Design an enzyme around this catalytic site. Structure first.
Site, short mmCIF file in Angstrom:
data_model
loop_
_atom_site.label_atom_id
_atom_site.label_comp_id
_atom_site.label_asym_id
_atom_site.label_seq_id
_atom_site.Cartn_x
_atom_site.Cartn_y
_atom_site.Cartn_z
N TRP A 251 0.82 -1.30 0.20
CA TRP A 251 -0.02 0.01 -0.15
C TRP A 251 0.91 1.34 -0.10
O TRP A 251 1.73 1.46 0.91
CB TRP A 251 -0.65 0.00 1.38
CG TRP A 251 -1.75 1.31 1.70
CD1 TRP A 251 -2.40 1.74 0.51
CD2 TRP A 251 -1.87 1.97 2.84
NE1 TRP A 251 -3.13 2.86 1.32
CE2 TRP A 251 -2.94 3.15 2.35
CE3 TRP A 251 -1.35 1.75 3.98
CZ2 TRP A 251 -3.11 4.11 3.43
CZ3 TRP A 251 -1.68 2.62 5.12
CH2 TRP A 251 -2.48 4.04 4.56
N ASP B 287 0.17 -4.29 10.31
CA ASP B 287 -0.65 -3.39 10.01
C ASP B 287 -2.00 -4.29 9.53
O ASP B 287 -1.77 -4.94 8.55
CB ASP B 287 -0.34 -2.65 8.86
CG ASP B 287 -1.29 -1.38 8.46
OD1 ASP B 287 -1.89 -0.99 9.12
OD2 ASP B 287 -1.47 -1.06 7.34
N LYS C 28 -12.74 -0.42 7.01
CA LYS C 28 -13.37 -1.34 6.18
C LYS C 28 -14.50 -2.33 7.03
O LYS C 28 -15.50 -2.34 6.65
CB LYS C 28 -12.51 -2.28 5.58
CG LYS C 28 -11.55 -1.74 4.36
CD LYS C 28 -11.01 -0.32 4.72
CE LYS C 28 -9.75 -0.10 3.36
NZ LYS C 28 -9.19 1.28 3.68
C1 LIG Z 1 -2.55 -2.33 4.10
C2 LIG Z 1 -3.59 -0.91 4.81
N1 LIG Z 1 -3.14 -0.17 6.22
C3 LIG Z 1 -3.66 0.55 6.77
C4 LIG Z 1 -4.85 1.41 6.19
C5 LIG Z 1 -5.58 2.42 6.75
O1 LIG Z 1 -6.40 3.58 6.09
P1 LIG Z 1 -7.22 4.13 7.13
O2 LIG Z 1 -6.37 5.33 7.79
O3 LIG Z 1 -8.41 4.44 6.55
O4 LIG Z 1 -7.62 3.00 8.07
C6 LIG Z 1 -5.49 0.75 4.80
C7 LIG Z 1 -6.48 1.63 3.88
N2 LIG Z 1 -5.88 1.74 2.67
C8 LIG Z 1 -4.62 -0.48 4.09
O5 LIG Z 1 -4.89 -0.84 2.91
#
Ligand SMILES: Cc1ncc(COP(=O)(O)O)c(CN)c1O
Ligand SMILES: Cc1ncc(COP(=O)(O)O)c(CN)c1O
Ligand SMILES: [Mg+2]
Ligand SMILES: [Mg+2]
Lengths: 398, 398
Positions: free
Chosen positions: A130, A211, A246
């Site tokens: 990501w 993560d 999500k």
């Molecule tokens: C691997 C990963 N880590 C963390 C996140 C965190 O995004 P958010 O700040 O929306 O939780 C995402 C959402 N793109 C992700 O895909």
């Protein structure tokens, strides 16, 4: 005054949505963002979230700052989900946990903490990952490299290379790891791979920084947390950033957590203190509204159970999309293999489409994926599956 | 693993908020806290907010990510409030504006932007200041000093000294300025002083960074924003962090803005782009709930008008407490002048009590102020104003 300030090229994943709104192809389709859509193609409002927000909305309450660490019950719900209800590490008071501004703010606060206290640690992210992992860590002045992960040629993992690379790393070097639902490839380690990885991590004394933004979308809540709970058992200095974006369908509220598992209660105390201090100097404290929704859903036994069911419906629809697309494509193109579609996990799939074929999908069909072949499986539904499968078949032939 | 991570001493105020909690004097009064309470001594829910949130809950909506810059209407409301409805600077596309996680979040993104692109700039905060200011700028690796501001001897401003200190600074050094409602002293610059401060900043080519957390609490919305608007009219490279925490009574939802006044549309675009890149590497995007509250209250004309009346009600309430307090002090303490108490503006007042006099208010009356004499005027209301005023009379007379 600001003539030298570079343009910002834009977020890759976003300038692509941008491009998608502007296309006026009738049957167009966004498979580029990492958002869950249901069978009808809309973002769900979870029933549990809906009840939680009705509670928040009645009465409208005063809005004092949250604690820097967020709501106690938010932080407790992050811990329990991740480590297990009543896990020993929690009974022992061995995890410092704050609420964070999404999983994104958890990575950030964790990276700033690491940068400050382990200034020599380098961070390594999966190749690929990501894109935001990199910018967040580097935005802390942390030096960032990549470990070998995805094997373009097999669609699996470069497991031996990866481990071999881990063996070159220094003590307290950080590895930024995806417990499940790899983003962007969907290609995940097996338990056995995890055990191996965690053994190397223990042996080299690296910092595992898991993560988890898709817990419940891989296999189930506990299985998806395997790599975390096993790092815990192994006494590793595990950092966990978790997102509810999500699995709570609550992207915009910015709800996640950062947890740091400590060998001793005094170290939890020190780590927790500094986590709060790092929050303070960044945004002072996190948003009440998202906090409450997490606090209420996580800790209300019936809303919790309901939420788990709703997340699993999301998990299963993605699985059925994977299954459906694979069988559709395998009926329609002879002697090609799309096993990767069902071997992968979570919202993402690396389709193995060429950057050219991804272009052809844009131009000839208004179907958007990332140029690296990443597709968001949740963008597929029964109204668009046949149009997408067909467009793929077409594009796999120039 | 973490034995060497320093303990964090905690929010400087918590040494007070817990000693107050423990105080067993039944007439104890906490004037040490930095929150607005209303005539009933509680944090108000504003009627405009209450309406906005009923609209947010009807219907309960999907919760996609906001833009990195927040909602367009939130960005617009901040601009119009700060710069004036339909201001030329706005009509010319010359303000780069993002939604932020409170003013703290605005100060943070701004500071990071200054550190990235003006890495030699040091930041100067008022002596004394709102201590979080310092931690935010130092947390970006920006060197922080102070400019002379408050005159202990006179209860007024060291204006000559402050100006002389500005004369020594480097091009692009940053002054963190409080356009009105000085925290912690309540001692503000007159418009003529702003004029001189802004000429000196212009002549020395300093970056004025205005932090406005109490617009509407000084004189009124336009006037409170005088310095901001005068800086723009003069063409200074103005940074403005604004917070809706106090004036929307929305602390916990984290709603503010950052605006950067640019000399051309192209600079606007580079600065905006880079603010978004900064947001992205920090928390990705801001919270939807508070964002929608700001959007709806700022841009609904009826709600906006109701909001202004509600703020000015808070503004007048605090003035009524300064007047009453002043009146009792003048009545009981012969010869001594207390005009400064009503010349000050906003929630905070440097009361002129010695540290010894402050200690006696805690120990004798359970009345808690910060040792520097800082009293939150909003902490006073019809239930305690006679008590506090009489106690202060006692303490001053001694
Ligand atoms: C691997 C990963 N880590 C963390 C996140 C965190 O995004 P958010 O700040 O929306 O939780 C995402 C959402 N793109 C992700 O895909
Ligand atoms: C001068 C000043 N600036 C900014 C803020 C920002 O706090 P918040 O993050 O809630 O806007 C405060 C506390 N209200 C303050 O006193
Ligand atoms: Mg549903
Ligand atoms: Mg930094």
């Amino acid at each position: 005054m600001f003539e030298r300030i570079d343009y910002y090229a834009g977020d890759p994943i976003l300038g692509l949505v941008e491009k998608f709104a502007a296309d006026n192809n009738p049957d167009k389709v966004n498979l580029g963002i990492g958002i869950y859509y249901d069978e009808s193609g809309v973002m769900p409002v979870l029933d549990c979230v809906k009840i939680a927000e009705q509670r928040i909305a009645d009465p409208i309450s005063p809005r004092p700052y949250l604690p820097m660490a967020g709501l106690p019950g938010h932080r407790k719900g992050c811990q329990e989900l991740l480590f297990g209800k009543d896990a020993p590490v929690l009974k022992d008071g061995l995890v410092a946990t704050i609420a964070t501004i999404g999983g994104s703010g958890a990575l950030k606060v964790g990276a700033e903490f690491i940068h400050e206290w382990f200034p020599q640690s380098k961070c390594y992210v999966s190749d690929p990952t990501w894109g935001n992992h990199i910018a967040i860590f580097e935005g802390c002045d942390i030096e960032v490299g990549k470990y070998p992960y995805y094997d373009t040629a097999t669609g699996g993992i470069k497991f031996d290379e990866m481990i071999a690379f881990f063996e070159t790393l220094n003590k307290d070097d950080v590895l930024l790891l995806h417990p499940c639902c790899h983003n962007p490839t969907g290609v995940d380690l097996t338990r056995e791979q995890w055990d191996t990885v965690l053994n190397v991590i223990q042996e080299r004394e690296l910092i595992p920084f898991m993560d988890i933004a898709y817990q419940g979308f891989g296999e189930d809540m506990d299985s998806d947390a395997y790599a975390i709970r096993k790092a815990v058992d192994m006494g590793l200095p595990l950092f966990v950033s978790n997102s509810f974006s999500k699995n709570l369908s609550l992207y915009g509220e910015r709800v996640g957590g950062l947890s740091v598992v400590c060998p001793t209660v005094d170290e939890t105390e020190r780590v927790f203190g500094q986590l709060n201090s790092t929050v303070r100097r960044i945004y002072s404290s996190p948003p009440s509204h998202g906090g409450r929704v997490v606090d209420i859903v996580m800790n209300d036994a019936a809303l919790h159970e309901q939420w788990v069911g709703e997340v699993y419906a999301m998990r299963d629809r993605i699985k059925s999309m994977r299954t459906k697309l694979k069988s559709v494509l395998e009926a329609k193109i002879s002697g090609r293999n799309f096993d990767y579609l069902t071997a992968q996990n979570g919202m993402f799939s690396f389709t193995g489409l060429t950057p050219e074929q991804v272009e052809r999908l844009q131009s000839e069909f208004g179907i958007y994926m990332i140029s690296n072949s990443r597709m968001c499986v949740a963008g597929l539904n029964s109204s668009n599956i046949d149009y997408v499968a067909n467009a793929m078949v077409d594009v796999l032939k120039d």
